[PDB]
Write a protein that binds this ligand. Structure first.
Ligand SMILES: [Ca+2]
Ligand SMILES: [Ca+2]
Ligand SMILES: [Ca+2]
Ligand SMILES: [Ca+2]
Ligand SMILES: [Ca+2]
Lengths: 214, 213
């Protein structure tokens, strides 16, 4: 779809160079290797989770799909009974997942998670802590934001962050709606504004999640 | 588990080879479309749809992503001419040969040049691919025997993303993402892998250039 003017698409010369001039891009290469297309909009969070968990090398489900190889897929993510217990795949397939549910679904695989609702932090701490993470291997960041607030269509979305460009104060979103939008470089204030919104399903603000190996 | 001759993209070295590469135009669009093969037999399908999506070729219209249109492994064979080249059920078992790969891409009105290893040479391959990897609007797919580059094991298909001039290595965007990462393979190893006879076709493997007519 059309990109709002305040967004710099990754599918451009300027978007490519913002990655090349970024000094906070460690997470991009592992995430790029795992980039997937959401099964549907509702599975925006499942696609983002398996990107991060595969990037972490989390020992994955053993199913007949790719046996003997082990890997997270949107098809086998809910093979974990505790994952289904958080929220069933039939339900996620309809309404997606909240930020809290996103954190718990990840924690149900033994992975360590830190959920940061926008209302519980600020933009300065968001920029600092996420930029630090994007310089570090072995951990990742997933964001949950209102697309409308960054000039996109339209509702709440979930997608990992891959890099941060210090010159432009922009974060790279690896948008799993690959049939709809490309990865975009978004200004920190725009992304903060979209995270500082209330998810009607949650009645809580959206935000960002830090994921790492326990 | 990669053999010593291969430099994995999941490495500091593999990342530098991309950052130090002057032949990497195709990586960024291909990265945006990177997909995991449904199964080994579909390595070619995952490869085709990566390239067709990158070229912006108008994609099938199906309920899955409607109104949006995109090439997926599940809908690639919605095209009757595509299915006429070789049926999805047969491709689901035995995959596709180099000739079938080209014809399958051509089934979508896309310009294709099939290059069998027996019809060219390593020098022209290195030369012609390195130049393609420096331009947009076209892409390279290779068909090769994994055994010859130190991998397991049979014939495989995947696109190329970049060429590292200083090491004479090509980066394979391996769509067997659960099995291997993208690898920087030396031109000598890749050619020897392409210069192998596929018993299904009784012809050598090779590479295909893809562009919009
Ligand atoms: Ca690193
Ligand atoms: Ca990180
Ligand atoms: Ca929602
Ligand atoms: Ca370009
Ligand atoms: Ca090219």
């Amino acid at each position: 779809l059309t990109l709002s003017p305040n967004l710099i698409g990754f599918n451009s010369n300027e978007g490519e160079k913002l990655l090349l001039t970024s000094r906070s891009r460690e997470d991009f290469f592992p995430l790029s290797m795992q980039f997937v297309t959401q099964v549907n909009q509702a599975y925006c969070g499942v696609a983002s989770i398996i990107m991060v968990l595969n990037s972490l090398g989390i020992n994955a489900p053993e199913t007949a799909q790719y046996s003997p190889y082990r890997v997270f897929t949107q098809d086998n993510f809910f093979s974990n009974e505790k994952t289904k217990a958080v929220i069933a795949p039939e339900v996620v397939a309809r309404q997606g997942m909240t930020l809290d549910e996103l954190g718990r679904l990840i924690a149900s695989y033994g992975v360590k998670v830190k959920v940061n609702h926008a209302s519980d932090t600020n933009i300065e701490d968001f920029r600092k802590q996420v930029a630090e993470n994007l310089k570090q291997d072995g951990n990742f960041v997933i964001v949950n934001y209102l697309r409308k607030e960054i000039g996109q269509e339209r509702g709440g979305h979930i997608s990992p962050l891959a890099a941060y460009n210090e010159q432009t104060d922009r974060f790279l979103i690896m948008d799993v709606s690959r049939y709809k939008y490309p990865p975009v470089w978004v200004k920190t204030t725009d992304l903060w504004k979209a995270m500082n919104t209330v998810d009607s399903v949650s009645q809580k603000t959206r935000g960002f999640v830090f994921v790492s190996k326990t």
